Amino acid sequence: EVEFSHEYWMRHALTLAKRARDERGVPVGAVLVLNNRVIGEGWNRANGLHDPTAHAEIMALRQGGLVMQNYRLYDATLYSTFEPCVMCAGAMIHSRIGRVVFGVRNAKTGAAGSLMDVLHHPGMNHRVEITEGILADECAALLCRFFRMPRRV
Amino acid sequence: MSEVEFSHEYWMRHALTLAKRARDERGVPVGAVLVLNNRVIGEGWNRANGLHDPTAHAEIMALRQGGLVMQNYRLYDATLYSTFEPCVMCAGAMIHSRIGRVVFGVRNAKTGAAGSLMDVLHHPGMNHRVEITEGILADECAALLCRFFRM
Ligand SMILES: [Zn+2]
Ligand SMILES: [Zn+2]
């Protein structure tokens, strides 16, 4: 897509979601971007990592803190193929990231407007901007484990 | 009073000792220990700045260490003792851990997600319900908010 755009980074998250094919649930892929540069990548690997927190968004935030040598990732934007859960939404507030961009909503456990809104809770110390709908048609297909293979040349 | 072995107050004192290792972190020192069948399977304290990990909270390390020993990201029937009420990020990890009970001492009137800022653990839309027990060693845990330790 157009370079350094929301749809551009969403395609990177869609590719990473394929690594979560052998996980119980919707495959989620996440990428953490700061100043048009990748500082963190992640996919769902709870069973593969024996970590109850090994979500796509969390692995991207965990890798970003190692790259930035700081648990605070100011002005960073996190691209996820799925609406964050209550655990992932809480991690973005503590990371103080600038924005989360997810494609399709999680009408079962999503914490960005569906089941609740943890990112926009009035009692929070940080506000993370929310942008939804980026590559929504392809991200919605991830709910049924569908991936795209378009025509080449 | 009397603190029986393998009891809630017994494990809370173990978490209070672990909290000393998080004294050099921005915020109140929190200590957590994960217990399954009266055996320690996970320990943790605040190490966000020391490890460059925004998720390096006390309860999360116990769940992360617990998942490593249990060889399973699902820690059924496990009890998590923390010196502080969990935040929104830690409380979300306990739902995914499928632990049986969380035991925290004092409430977190700033970032707590177990009654203070919200109650996510008992939300009806969750796939798992974690039992809540609060107030265990509250006096020794409330002093931890002001960096006070008993001698
Ligand atoms: Zn999540
Ligand atoms: Zn926490």
Numbering used by the authors:
A (entry chain A): 3 to 155
B (entry chain B): 1 to 151
Copy out sentences from the published article reporting this entry, exactly as the authors wrote them:
To confer the favorable attributes of ABEs upon a CBE, we envisioned transforming TadA into an enzyme capable of robust cytidine deamination and subsequently generated an improved class of CBEs that uses TadA instead of a naturally occurring cytidine deaminase. Here we describe the development of two families of base editors, CABE-Ts and CBE-Ts, which use variants of TadA to catalyze the deamination of cytosines with either retention (CABE-Ts) or loss (CBE-Ts) of adenine deamination. To illuminate how amino acid substitutions identified from directed evolution affect TADAC’s substrate tolerance, we determined crystal structures of TadA*8.20 from ABE8.20-m13, the template used to evolve CABE-T1, and TADAC-1 variants from CABE-T1 reported here. Through X-ray crystallography, we show how the accumulation of substitutions impacts the shape of the active site cavity and may contribute to the accommodation of cytosine as substrate and the subsequent shift in specificity toward C-to-U deamination.
In addition to the perturbations on the right side of the TADAC-1.14 active site cavity, evaluation of the TADAC-1.19 structure reveals that other substitutions (E27G and I49N) from our evolution caused major structural changes on the left side of the active site cavity. These structural changes are likely caused by the E27G substitution, which results in the loss of essential hydrogen bonds between E27 and A48, I49 and G50. Because of these hydrogen bond losses, a conformational change occurred that reoriented residue E25 of TADAC-1.19 to a similar position that was formerly occupied by residue E27 in TadA*8.20. The displacement of E25 shortens the α1-helix, changes the length and conformation of the loop between α1 and β1 (D24 to P29) containing the E27G substitution and unfolds α5- and α6-helices, reshaping the TADAC-T1.19 active site cavity and potentially impacting target nucleobase binding within the active site.
